[PDB]
Amino acid sequence: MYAYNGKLLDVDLTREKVKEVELSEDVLKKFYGGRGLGTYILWKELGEKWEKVDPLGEENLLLILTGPLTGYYPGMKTSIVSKSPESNGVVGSVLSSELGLELKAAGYDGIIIRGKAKSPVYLFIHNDTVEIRDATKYWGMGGIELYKTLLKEVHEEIRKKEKLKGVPKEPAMIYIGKGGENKVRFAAIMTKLMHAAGYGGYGAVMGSKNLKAVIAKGSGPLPEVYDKEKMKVLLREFWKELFSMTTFREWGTGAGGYSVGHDRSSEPIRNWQEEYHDNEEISVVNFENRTWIKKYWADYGCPVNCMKISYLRYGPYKGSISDAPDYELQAYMGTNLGIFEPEKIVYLSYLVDELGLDGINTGNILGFAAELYQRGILTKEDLGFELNWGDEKAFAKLLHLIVEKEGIGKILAEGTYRAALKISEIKGIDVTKYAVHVKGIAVGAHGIRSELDYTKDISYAVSVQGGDHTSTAALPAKGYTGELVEAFYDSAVICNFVTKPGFEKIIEFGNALSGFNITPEQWLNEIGLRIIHLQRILLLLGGPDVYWDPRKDDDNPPRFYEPLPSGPVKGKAPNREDIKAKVKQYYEEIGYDEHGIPKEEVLEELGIGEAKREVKRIKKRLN
Amino acid sequence: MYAYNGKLLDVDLTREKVKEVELSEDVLKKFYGGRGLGTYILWKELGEKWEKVDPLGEENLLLILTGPLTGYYPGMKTSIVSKSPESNGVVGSVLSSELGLELKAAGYDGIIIRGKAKSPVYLFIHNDTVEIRDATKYWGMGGIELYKTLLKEVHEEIRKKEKLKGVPKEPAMIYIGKGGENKVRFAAIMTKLMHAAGYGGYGAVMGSKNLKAVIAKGSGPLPEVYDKEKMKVLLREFWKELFSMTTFREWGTGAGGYSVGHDRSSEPIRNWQEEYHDNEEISVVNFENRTWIKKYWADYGCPVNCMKISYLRYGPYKGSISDAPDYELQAYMGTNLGIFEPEKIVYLSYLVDELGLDGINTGNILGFAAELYQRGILTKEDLGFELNWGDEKAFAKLLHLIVEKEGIGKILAEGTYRAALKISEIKGIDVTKYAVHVKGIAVGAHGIRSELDYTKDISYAVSVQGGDHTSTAALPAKGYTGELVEAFYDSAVICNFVTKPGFEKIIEFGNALSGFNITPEQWLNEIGLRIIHLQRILLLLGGPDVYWDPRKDDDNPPRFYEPLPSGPVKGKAPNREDIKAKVKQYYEEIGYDEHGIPKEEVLEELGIGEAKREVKRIKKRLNL
Amino acid sequence: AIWILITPDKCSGCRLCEVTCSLEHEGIIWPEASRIRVFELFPGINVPHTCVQCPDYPCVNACPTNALSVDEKTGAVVVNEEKCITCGACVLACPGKVPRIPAGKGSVVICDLCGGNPKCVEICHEAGHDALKIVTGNYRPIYRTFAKDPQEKSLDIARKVFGEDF
Amino acid sequence: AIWILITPDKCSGCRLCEVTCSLEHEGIIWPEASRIRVFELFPGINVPHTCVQCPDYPCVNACPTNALSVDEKTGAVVVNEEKCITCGACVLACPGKVPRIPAGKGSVVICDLCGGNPKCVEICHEAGHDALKIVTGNYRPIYRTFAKDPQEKSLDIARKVFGEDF
Numbered sequence A: 001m002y003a004y005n006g007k008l009l010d011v012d013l014t015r016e017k018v019k020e021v022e023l024s025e026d027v028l029k030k031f032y033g034g035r036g037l038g039t040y041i042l043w044k045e046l047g048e049k050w051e052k053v054d055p056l057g058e059e060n061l062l063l064i065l066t067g068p069l070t071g072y073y074p075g076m077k078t079s080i081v082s083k084s085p086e087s088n089g090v091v092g093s094v095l096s097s098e099l100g101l102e103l104k105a106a107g108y109d110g111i112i113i114r115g116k117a118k119s120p121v122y123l124f125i126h127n128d129t130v131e132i133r134d135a136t137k138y139w140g141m142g143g144i145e146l147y148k149t150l151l152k153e154v155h156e157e158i159r160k161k162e163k164l165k166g167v168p169k170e171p172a173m174i175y176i177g178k179g180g181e182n183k184v185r186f187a188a189i190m191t192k193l194m195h196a197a198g199y200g201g202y203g204a205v206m207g208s209k210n211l212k213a214v215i216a217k218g219s220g221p222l223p224e225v226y227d228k229e230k231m232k233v234l235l236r237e238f239w240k241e242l243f244s245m246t247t248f249r250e251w252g253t254g255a256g257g258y259s260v261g262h263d264r265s266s267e268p269i270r271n272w273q274e275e276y277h278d279n280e281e282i283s284v285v286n287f288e289n290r291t292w293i294k295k296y297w298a299d300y301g302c303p304v305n306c307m308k309i310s311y312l313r314y315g316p317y318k319g320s321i322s323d324a325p326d327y328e329l330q331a332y333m334g335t336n337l338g339i340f341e342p343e344k345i346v347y348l349s350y351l352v353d354e355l356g357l358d359g360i361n362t363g364n365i366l367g368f369a370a371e372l373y374q375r376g377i378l379t380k381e382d383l384g385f386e387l388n389w390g391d392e393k394a395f396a397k398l399l400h401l402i403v404e405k406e407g408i409g410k411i412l413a414e415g416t417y418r419a420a421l422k423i424s425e426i427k428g429i430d431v432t433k434y435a436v437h438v439k440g441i442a443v444g445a446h447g448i449r450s451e452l453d454y455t456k457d458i459s460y461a462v463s464v465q466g467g468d469h470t471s472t473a474a475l476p477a478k479g480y481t482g483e484l485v486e487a488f489y490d491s492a493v494i495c496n497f498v499t500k501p502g503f504e505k506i507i508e509f510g511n512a513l514s515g516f517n518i519t520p521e522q523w524l525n526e527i528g529l530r531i532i533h534l535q536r537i538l539l540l541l542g543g544p545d546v547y548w549d550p551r552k553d554d555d556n557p558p559r560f561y562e563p564l565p566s567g568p569v570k571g572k573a574p575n576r577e578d579i580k581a582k583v584k585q586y587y588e589e590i591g592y593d594e595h596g597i598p599k600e601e602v603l604e605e606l607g608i609g610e611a612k613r614e615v616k617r618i619k620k621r622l623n
Numbered sequence B: 001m002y003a004y005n006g007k008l009l010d011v012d013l014t015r016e017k018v019k020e021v022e023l024s025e026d027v028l029k030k031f032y033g034g035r036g037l038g039t040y041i042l043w044k045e046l047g048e049k050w051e052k053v054d055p056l057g058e059e060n061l062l063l064i065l066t067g068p069l070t071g072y073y074p075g076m077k078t079s080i081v082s083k084s085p086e087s088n089g090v091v092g093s094v095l096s097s098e099l100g101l102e103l104k105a106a107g108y109d110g111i112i113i114r115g116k117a118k119s120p121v122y123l124f125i126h127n128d129t130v131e132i133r134d135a136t137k138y139w140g141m142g143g144i145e146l147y148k149t150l151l152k153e154v155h156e157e158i159r160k161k162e163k164l165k166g167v168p169k170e171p172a173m174i175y176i177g178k179g180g181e182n183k184v185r186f187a188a189i190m191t192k193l194m195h196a197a198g199y200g201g202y203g204a205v206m207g208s209k210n211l212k213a214v215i216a217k218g219s220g221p222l223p224e225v226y227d228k229e230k231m232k233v234l235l236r237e238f239w240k241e242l243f244s245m246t247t248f249r250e251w252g253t254g255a256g257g258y259s260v261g262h263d264r265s266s267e268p269i270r271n272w273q274e275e276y277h278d279n280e281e282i283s284v285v286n287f288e289n290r291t292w293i294k295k296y297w298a299d300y301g302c303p304v305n306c307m308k309i310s311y312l313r314y315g316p317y318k319g320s321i322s323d324a325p326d327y328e329l330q331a332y333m334g335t336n337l338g339i340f341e342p343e344k345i346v347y348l349s350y351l352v353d354e355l356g357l358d359g360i361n362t363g364n365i366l367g368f369a370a371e372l373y374q375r376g377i378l379t380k381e382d383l384g385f386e387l388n389w390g391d392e393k394a395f396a397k398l399l400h401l402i403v404e405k406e407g408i409g410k411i412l413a414e415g416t417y418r419a420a421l422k423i424s425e426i427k428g429i430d431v432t433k434y435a436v437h438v439k440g441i442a443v444g445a446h447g448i449r450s451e452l453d454y455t456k457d458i459s460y461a462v463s464v465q466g467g468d469h470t471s472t473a474a475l476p477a478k479g480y481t482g483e484l485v486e487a488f489y490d491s492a493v494i495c496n497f498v499t500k501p502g503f504e505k506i507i508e509f510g511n512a513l514s515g516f517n518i519t520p521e522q523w524l525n526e527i528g529l530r531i532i533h534l535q536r537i538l539l540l541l542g543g544p545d546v547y548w549d550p551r552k553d554d555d556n557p558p559r560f561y562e563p564l565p566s567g568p569v570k571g572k573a574p575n576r577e578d579i580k581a582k583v584k585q586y587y588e589e590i591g592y593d594e595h596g597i598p599k600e601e602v603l604e605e606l607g608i609g610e611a612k613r614e615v616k617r618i619k620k621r622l623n624l
Numbered sequence C, D: 001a002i003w004i005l006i007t008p009d010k011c012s013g014c015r016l017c018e019v020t021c022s023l024e025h026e027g028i029i030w031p032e033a034s035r036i037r038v039f040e041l042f043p044g045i046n047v048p049h050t051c052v053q054c055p056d057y058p059c060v061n062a063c064p065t066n067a068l069s070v071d072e073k074t075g076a077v078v079v080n081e082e083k084c085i086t087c088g089a090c091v092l093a094c095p096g097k098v099p100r101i102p103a104g105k106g107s108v109v110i111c112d113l114c115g116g117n118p119k120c121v122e123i124c125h126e127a128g129h130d131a132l133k134i135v136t137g138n139y140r141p142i143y144r145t146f147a148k149d150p151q152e153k154s155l156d157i158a159r160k161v162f163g164e165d166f
């Protein structure tokens, strides 16, 4: 076919068996790829027993996916989809690994990873060769050492193999750190030190299957495309337009650490107790002059080059390496902990990258703990040390308790939602009022109270990915912002930052690749909608330990109803009954009933009628 | 006055007095600036007693000079001129210090430094304020530490003073390192860590006066110019031409360490025993990938940005900083010592920069010692250790003996020529046959035997700057290569690397600044010629310890007559009879008599008839 | 509207920006009268420094004689040199110490953006350094945080490059 | 005569050069068929790698079936893909390990300088990276020393940036 190989790898780590499975054109026209394709596979294989599947057990599926735009659209993303250890629903995460490109160049569109290896393994894919290999020497390594050993050794192996064909480029590698190895709930899947499949806890899923890394190298062409000269014309168009985004190419998201708090008053400061600051220490000019050793860094075929590398050659944290750091790390590993200095923020960002922990949910649990310490709820005896705002060494000590699940680390390693329930139970006090999460996922570093940011009222409240600021809901529920357009980019799969040409132009590019005739209206009313409904269903079915009730859990954390205590919109916060009105309105526009459960009529019009079986179980454990 | 302020600072370190002296239009039309102006001042003040002037004694003058194009023409050079501890003549040396630019913005065109301070001092110039200041705390500092302390403190002082006028740019600084403080004969004057007034031994002159540094800051405009609109037009055109020199902007002289020996077979290898190599370790690609932390570094107003910064973060020499290194360091602190690895060359280039030693005459003395060791003339017991080719640690230990004048270092610190005579006398063996010098100055790293380089037959032999490869002679003696055009750039003062527009266009640019109407012909036949003749006269008068005889010393070192042992032109070398023929012909065209002494007639036409008094002292000593 | 984005680590120290700006505005070479000045406090660490057009214009509001105003089209500061009494108030009001009074001028100098077509950016681009680039579009408040002391930017960069050995 | 001068520390790893070259020569995106290939053995150390047109053409002179020749106008290697038996002799003769046989192609690929107008340099310049530049004079023998194993260049750069900590 066009744009796809029409093929997935199917890897049973339990039986140590690999096979190829066909991707029908029917499935691809219905679900496209990435997030959509993974949601289908998960519902198809697990939806009947969903509430019994432990995300950290042998029966979960880890899906590594691409989409038709995967090799051809500017920039580079690989999609990762699984049952989430955080929400017990599904998260379409992405990361800028060339893994998806190398898979496509090797003949595949993705990997279904089943079961659980008896000992640490890694998956090695080189053109037609696929092997499950012992990884016990690398279990315990962070990313830097993993590149210097495992990745280097595999590249030399491949170079010896192809001595007479020349020197192949390096293979792509996704991997976990010690956080995923020890099943910390908010562990990430990493690539190239600094890129993450961040939301969802998939580092813990990967770690729970004893999978250290996936390494892939392809040397053939990408699948052919339907209209090659329309592809070339649009590509030149897209490059010219993307080259013009001067400040985003020069600074990336690294201007956010100052600008989100100062300009939009929507940045978490000390576990969201404030959302405004005027602290110029954290301005990008200081990250650049004090830490940036590479100002322009790009993923495959990317004209934006939004990435940067920060590196510390001085001070006690000498050796720390991170990116700009990304704004979400500047906020959650910085201002959310009361820390405004680049040197300390690069240090803490380096630690979560090296440990393979999602910086958002990590900073959220750390700021949560620090607020409990400030309020006397967690004592110096509970922690083992003082946990003051601004003290980067106290926060690094806590990070290492979490990854080793030592002392209080064993509770915190379960994530903010579960920890706040456990501590509430233990202390006889409601500490869930300090947990800033939605559906068990830490709220991304864009608050709703100021209404000066893109996030407001129901953005997180009704979303099938909860606190995930990269896939928020909007009103109108269709229309070019909101879950449906975001589900597209996560199914393409393409990088968000490279969508300047616009949703329609990008669908048009996709049709020129694939030979499909998908329209924006069909995405918004059918393909996108059925992805969102299946994710809503799996999220409402919930996991074995935590279940959501839309009448309770389609809401903002209560801190978001307290008036902002500072800044140029001091006193502002949304009103709880206005949110409920908007939640009700979102339900109708998206096709959920009045309780927020997808309408069975809608499910049949969408072609996923057999999901009514799942809706009935929802309604039972509902009424 | 156009293009000039019309005045020099006159600094007497002995009496600790400072005054301004007037620079007449007539002197400037006669000698232009820089190397020429300095040669005049030296002849006028000292020429009648030249042969009694010790370059290392308090009667020597140290001249820091500009020319009319300094500050306007692209690039930046300051001129340094004195009596040379090496040749006992005069060297128009330059370095890319903004000192000349700041001086001109402060109202002066140069500094005459006389006498000798009782203890270490530095000279501080800030617009109207000129002060001699205690430098005792800074004596002994290399350039890195000097920038971090002295220069920083002085910048903060200027900031505090000009608090209500804003933040001044940094002052410019020239300085000496330990080699200069200890009067090592081939010590350089340094700026910005890795730029040098390299040839001439002027770091020893400055060290002999107890002058650690000169620091200058000006914040006024440069002098008015005669035709500012023409200046502006030519600048744009010059920039556009200079921008196009792609490989020189990307690599500087850094491709020389490989290309001079491999392509031109004219690079010194193991004290010139070979001149060809095939070794790719020294290619610029390996300096760039292993060591360059700044690929484009430029001096003031320079569109060429030929400079680079090399810095080692690894290995035993971690912390070493230098430039590409400059080709002459890659050869003389590298291949000349049998060292081809960039890491080791950056290390040795850093040491020579940090000590304030000219890399050319330093590598020359080091390779000379290593060949004496190889031949058994200098023993392990004479040195205190083995001095094998390729051993960068052996060479570094010897560098430190030299600067401290300890053991064999005390002899070596006098330079290759004087050391070869002392060793010859001590050992009863002629080791001058291994000394590659002309008129007491180490031959620059461009040999003559292959004839594939720009240097050939009489290039060093007849030059008033001896082994100085940056001011060689050529045949025809006038015309657009040779000593006269080099003396122009050393007097203009501008950087050689920025002369792509050509000698004629650069003169025309000079006239648009100054309101003069100098032509190329009068530079070649008068102004340049009188500069060269006074330099020839002063070199023939010679210092107190060493004198030259043109019948003997207008020649190439003996190694340049042995056939090349290797490479594509194995077997090649000039014949000493053809050199003699060319030397006598060079005399005719430049206006020297049969014995290479300037013609009394020519001196009169050139307008320097009084120098006949010096010519007669020369014939008296040479008994005609 | 335009704003000059500076990347100090791409700065070669060629100072052709200073030559171009001071020739353009003064007709003569005059380093300290250039409205962009490059600070090289340690060899090879080059920090170009100029106006950032603070939205609150501290300089303009501190001027006691109203010598300073804001151009309506560009947003640049404009100096009336005849009104300027060289008191240094704008120098002290400026978060980055940008205003400069060169010796003998009789007035401050502050970047006027060349009326909307920076000649410093053009020559830096022509030279291939691109340490200066133009951003077009609405002012972002983070731009204002680039007005900081050139000596702190220089010490920051030197420690980043040379580490504990600086 | 043109030659591509590469500055690895200006390389962002955008690999738009790979996309342009493979689209131009294969009509499809195909990273390992690009005649310029960027090696990123450690994150952030990006080494672009291509033919240097050795004046002694080791590849051309090692080819057993005479599939390789030299273009008279440009100095570039030309591949006759129908004559190529993918034996790897040119791969082994090349000082830089530059010739590449991509999977399923049936022929080596080697840079042909785009007939004298490199499209990789154009896109690299348009993106503002300028890691690739054209030099236009006569061939200099030092160019040949740029043909080096990409792994050696990467390790050199990594050590120069990260020091003893690498």
Ligand SMILES: CCC[C@H](O)S(=O)(=O)O
Pocket: A253, A255, A256, A326, A327, A328, A445, A470
């Ligand atoms: C300044 C915008 C930041 C991006 O939205 S993010 O928070 O890095 O996802």
Ligand SMILES: CCC[C@H](O)S(=O)(=O)O
Pocket: B252, B253, B254, B255, B256, B326, B327, B328, B445, B470
């Ligand atoms: C490659 C030419 C080098 C220059 O001539 S130099 O020897 O650095 O003076």
Ligand code: SF4
Pocket: A075, A076, A096, A297, A298, A299, A300, A302, A303, A304, A305, A306, A307, A495, A496, A497, A498
């Ligand atoms: S925009 Fe940034 S993240 Fe997205 S692909 Fe390009 S470089 Fe990678």
Ligand code: SF4
Pocket: B075, B076, B096, B297, B298, B299, B300, B302, B303, B304, B305, B306, B307, B495, B496, B497, B498
């Ligand atoms: S060419 Fe090199 S040395 Fe001459 S002035 Fe320009 S940068 Fe300095």
Ligand code: SF4
Pocket: C010, C011, C012, C013, C014, C015, C016, C017, C018, C038, C046, C048, C123, C124, C127, C129, C130, C131, C132
């Ligand atoms: S022109 Fe660009 S590179 Fe040269 S000094 Fe000015 S800013 Fe730095």
Ligand code: SF4
Pocket: C050, C051, C052, C053, C054, C057, C058, C059, C060, C077, C093, C094, C095, C096, C097, C098, C099, C110, C147
């Ligand atoms: S930077 Fe200084 S000078 Fe420019 S606007 Fe702000 S205050 Fe005025």
Ligand code: SF4
Pocket: C062, C063, C064, C065, C066, C067, C068, C083, C084, C085, C086, C087, C088, C089, C090, C091, C099, C107, C108
């Ligand atoms: S210096 Fe001139 S411009 Fe600045 S405040 Fe005083 S008067 Fe106004």
Ligand code: SF4
Pocket: C020, C021, C022, C034, C035, C036, C050, C110, C111, C112, C113, C114, C117, C118, C119, C120, C121
């Ligand atoms: S924009 Fe114009 S005025 Fe402002 S600095 Fe650049 S050149 Fe000078």
Ligand code: SF4
Pocket: D010, D011, D012, D013, D014, D015, D016, D017, D018, D038, D046, D048, D123, D124, D129, D130, D131, D132
């Ligand atoms: S285009 Fe230039 S910057 Fe991008 S990868 Fe190719 S060489 Fe490196």
Ligand code: SF4
Pocket: D050, D051, D052, D053, D054, D057, D058, D059, D060, D077, D093, D094, D095, D096, D097, D098, D099, D110, D147
């Ligand atoms: S670089 Fe390799 S491929 Fe190119 S000419 Fe030299 S040998 Fe042939």
Ligand code: SF4
Pocket: D062, D063, D064, D065, D066, D067, D068, D083, D084, D085, D086, D087, D088, D089, D090, D091, D099, D107, D108
């Ligand atoms: S691989 Fe093809 S081109 Fe290279 S030598 Fe063998 S046949 Fe000739």
Ligand code: SF4
Pocket: D020, D021, D034, D035, D036, D050, D110, D111, D112, D113, D114, D117, D118, D119, D120, D121
């Ligand atoms: S020059 Fe043409 S062929 Fe050679 S690499 Fe660049 S794009 Fe490919």
Ligand SMILES: [Cl-]
Pocket: B144, C162, C165, C166
């Ligand atoms: Cl240092």
Ligand SMILES: [Cl-]
Pocket: A144, D162, D165, D166
């Ligand atoms: Cl490292």
Ligand SMILES: [Mg+2]
Pocket: A194, A195, A196, A323, A326
């Ligand atoms: Mg990151």
Ligand SMILES: [Mg+2]
Pocket: A092, A093, A094, A199, A470, A471
């Ligand atoms: Mg996302």
